Amino acid sequence: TNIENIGDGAEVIKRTEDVSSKKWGVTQNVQFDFVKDKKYNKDALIVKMQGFINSRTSFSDVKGSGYELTKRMIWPFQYNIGLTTKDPNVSLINYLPKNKIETTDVGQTLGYNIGGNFQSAPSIGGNGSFNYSKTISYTQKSYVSEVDKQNSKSVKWGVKANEFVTPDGKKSAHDRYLFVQSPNGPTGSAREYFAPDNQLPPLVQSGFNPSFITTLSHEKGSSDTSEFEISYGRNLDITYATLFPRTGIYAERKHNAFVNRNFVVRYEVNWKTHEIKVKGHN
Ligand SMILES: [Cl-]
Ligand SMILES: [Cl-]
């Protein structure tokens, strides 16, 4: 189940890697599909990036005197998915999502026909008019997807915090009092200073399950192997909630406190032997 006939003297060699990190709280479940097609004089690798990026959300006390009633909530303001390469021989010919998509569910399809013909569709609908297709699918309740950077050598997506449903209407990702609440007593736990799990969406509470694609073209001839990095990470904001007994709760946001905390894995493609292997990581 690692080689598939897609029509003609054309087939797809399916390879997959699974690299994880407890430090970064990330898991890369990538699928590297090589496109073998005599009628298309260029190597092509369809990389489908999946896995899990831990929200890394944490509620805790704040050490130091004068802060006994100041609690801290750390959460992911944005998830980061990206793939960059340096080898001159390689170029990114396509990527999904191609444009900014802000619906709760993201479902797109990358199609391929013999003769090097790729086309994308922002829907997982019909209708098998491709020799081979790969699809992305992920939910982002309260978040928005956008292509931060892109060129022939790299692509980088960002799943940003956008708007959240609250007991009292909507609230933006920049609202300083987002997720804060009085804990019903000064003896209340750190967690009680913030919104309960039922009001927190998956991307905040649990984490994010990425699902992205990007095809790489390669010039046949003394360009035997290429390397590229894949980043899965997040940008974290801090939300401090201080209880003034008998008064109320004072909150303050520290936006972009921990940016670019990413887990970068370096891979190598052996175009000739149609094979993949991990060179290293952080
Ligand atoms: Cl698929
Ligand atoms: Cl209050």
Author numbering: 30 to 311
List passages from the publication reporting this PDB structure:
Leukotoxin ED (LukED) is one of these bicomponent pore-forming toxins that Staphylococcus aureus produces in order to suppress the ability of the host to contain the infection. The bicomponent pore-forming toxins have two separate water-soluble subunits, one of class S (related to the slow-eluted component of PVL) and one of class F (related to the fast-eluted component of PVL). The S subunit is typically involved in targeting the specific cell type via the interaction with surface receptors and in the recruitment of the other toxin subunits, leading to oligomerization and the formation of an octameric prepore. The prepore is composed of alternating S and F subunits and is able to assemble a β-barrel pore domain in the cell membrane, producing the mature pore that ultimately induces cell death by osmotic lysis.
Crystals of LukE12–311 and LukD27–327 provided measureable X-ray diffraction data to 3.2 and 1.7 Å resolution, respectively. Each of the two crystal structures had one molecule in the asymmetric unit, and the two refined models included amino acids 30–311 of a total of 311 for LukE and amino acids 27–325 of a total of 327 for LukD. Furthermore, LukE binds CXCR1 and CXCR2 and previous studies have identified the L3 loop in the rim domain as the binding region. The crystal structure of LukE provides insight into the residues required for receptor identification. We argue that the structural features that determine the binding of LukE to CXCR1/CXCR2 receptors in contrast to LukS-PV are dependent on the presence of glycine and proline residues in loop L3 (Pro212, Gly214, Pro215 and Gly217) as well as a different distribution of polar residues (Gln210, Asn213, Thr216 and Ser211). The fact that loop L3 in LukE is one residue longer compared with the same loop in LukS-PV results in positioning residues Pro215-Thr216 so that the local solvent exposure is higher. Indeed, the solvent-exposed surface of loop L3 is 1750.8 Å2 in LukE and 1472.4 Å2 in LukS-PV with a different charge distribution. These important variations could explain the different specificity of binding of LukE and LukS-PV to chemokine receptors.
